[PDB]
């Protein structure tokens, strides 16, 4: 049995009430995502106060009894916080599906002297032996 | 470690009503829901 553990077996401390306790709503990696498309209307909307995915409670207890609606397309299952750092992204249940992030890249820090960046890179009919492209799944 | 690869209950979840419920689309992870527990409506 290769790589085999349960992360969420004793992780930190706290106090948590035993009935408080969901057994649905896990955004988690089993759902053919797709990027899609921007969709704008005649109507401009707040769109709702945005805010950050560093949510301290992130709850979702879902009123599943006083009615529902059942979904056999993919629209069924919403993920959420998987674009960052997502305290939902980790509630795996299998220790191996790390497909729950997005690793960026960062930008060096104002306050230097003499404007040194990256070079441009600029391929012209060299064509690598080394081609394609390859994404970078980290961590929660 | 997973508890249930070392124990396996190996409990069934079967509802007196099947309507309005959802369950995870992946056959690989499907273990769980075993793995877990159900709730009551």
Same mark, same amino acid.
Do not use: R
């Given at each position: 049995m290769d790589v085999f553990m349960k992360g969420? %077996? !004793?992780?930190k401390e706290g106090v948590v009430a035993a009935? /408080? #306790?969901? !057994?649905?709503?896990?955004? /988690?990696?089993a759902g053919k995502t797709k990027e899609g498309v921007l969709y704008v209307g005649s109507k401009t909307k707040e769109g709702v106060v945005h805010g950050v995915a $560093?949510?301290?409670? #992130? =709850?979702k207890e879902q009123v599943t009894n006083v009615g529902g609606a059942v979904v =056999?397309? @993919? =629209?069924?299952v919403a993920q959420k916080?998987? /674009?960052?750092?997502? %305290?939902?992204?980790?509630? $795996?249940?299998? @220790? !191996? !599906?790390?497909?729950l992030g997005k690793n960026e890249e960062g930008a060096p820090q104002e306050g230097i002297l003499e404007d040194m960046p990256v070079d441009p890179d600029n391929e012209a009919y /060299?064509?690598? %032996?080394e081609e394609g492209y390859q994404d970078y799944e980290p961590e929660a | 470690h997973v508890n249930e690869l070392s124990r396996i209950k190996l409990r069934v979840c079967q509802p007196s009503r099947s309507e309005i419920h959802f369950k995870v689309k992946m056959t690989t992870h499907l273990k769980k829901l075993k793995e877990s527990y159900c709730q009551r409506q």
């Open positions: 969420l %077996s !004793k992780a009935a /408080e #306790k969901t !057994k649905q709503g896990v955004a /988690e990696a $560093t949510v301290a409670e #992130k =709850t =056999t397309g @993919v =629209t069924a916080t998987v /674009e960052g750092a997502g %305290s939902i992204a980790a509630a $795996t249940g299998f @220790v !191996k !599906k790390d497909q /060299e064509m690598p %032996s | -």
